[PDB]
């Protein structure tokens, strides 16, 4: 069921672009709307930013193939390179309705699109990064993820990760034969 | 600059000898811990330690009977080189 990796990587790329739209990491003047999941989405048209997102999900896809990823996380960092909010895609993995699962992903997009309602404003000058939490610490994980030259990965320190006393804002959970995933946000207690 | 407790270098050289010499199949977790130790030396601007750590490990790991320690060394260095290539524009000599 490595279709899941192909489906998830498509979805995560779309969800990362939308997350940076909705949280204002980047100017409105680089987004353009496009249709995924027969819901609209708002994707970047900046090449360097698009390359960073595609480079990242190119390296993750094979860890997804073996169900070796517990979480893919989009981290909003503050100007001090400190996490301020985290969008966590928590992942658990033939009556096969692959066609119906892709459309269950639309509800993620609509929840993401309206999530500034239920979240505090971020400090100005935020950037982001991507964390991949593996199910187990395995040599094979890092062998698979270092395939793009000029795009190496490292093991994150507690600084790349740690938020004191965060709040948890659940957004959407799905429960299928082939894809068990939920999206929740962790926001920093304060600014 | 942590390696599983040891800040002082000579202590690191000592945690790494006990580990490589007495244990014939290392857990992947500990190999990853040495890679993170090495990439942290890069962030913290200690290329001399980095060089000395690689040299110490290359001796001990390549001298092992157990072929696992040989492939663990290749793995460690591979993940250090790709960090150096980007952070410094270059590759560590041996």
């Amino acid at each position: 069921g490595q279709v899941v990796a192909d489906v998830l990587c498509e979805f995560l790329e779309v969800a990362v672009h939308l997350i940076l739209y909705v949280r204002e990491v980047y100017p409105v003047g680089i987004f353009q709307k496009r249709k995924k999941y027969n819901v609209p989405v708002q994707m970047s048209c900046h090449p360097e930013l698009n390359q960073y997102i595609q480079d990242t999900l190119h390296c993750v896809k094979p860890l997804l193939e073996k169900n070796d990823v517990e979480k893919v996380v989009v981290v909003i960092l503050d100007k001090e390179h400190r996490p301020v909010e985290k969008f966590v895609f928590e992942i658990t993995q033939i009556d096969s309705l692959l066609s119906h699962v892709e459309q269950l992903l639309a509800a993620f997009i609509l929840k993401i699109s309206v999530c500034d309602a239920v979240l505090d404003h971020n400090p100005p000058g935020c950037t982001f990064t991507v964390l991949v939490h593996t199910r187990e610490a395995a040599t094979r994980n890092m062998e698979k993820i270092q395939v793009i030259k000029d795009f190496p990965w490292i093991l994150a320190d507690e600084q790349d990760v740690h938020m004191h006393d965060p709040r948890l804002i659940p957004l959407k959970t799905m429960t299928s034969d082939i894809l068990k995933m939920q999206l929740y946000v962790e926001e920093r207690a304060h600014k | 600059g942590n390696l599983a407790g040891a800040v002082e270098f000579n202590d690191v050289k000592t945690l790494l000898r006990e580990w490589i010499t007495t244990i014939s199949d290392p857990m992947e977790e500990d190999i990853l811990q040495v890679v993170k130790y090495c990439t942290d030396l890069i962030e913290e601007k200690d290329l001399e330690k980095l060089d000395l750590v690689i040299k110490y490990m290359k001796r001990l790991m390549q001298q092992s009977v157990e072929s696992v320690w040989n492939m663990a060394f290749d793995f460690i260095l591979d993940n250090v080189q790709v960090v150096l290539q980007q952070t410094y524009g270059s590759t560590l000599k041996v």
Partner: peptide
Amino acid sequence: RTANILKPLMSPPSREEIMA
């Protein structure tokens, strides 16, 4: 200090780089 968290070394382009 468990070692199961991977991240790109590289930063994405800064809000600056993009409005060139």
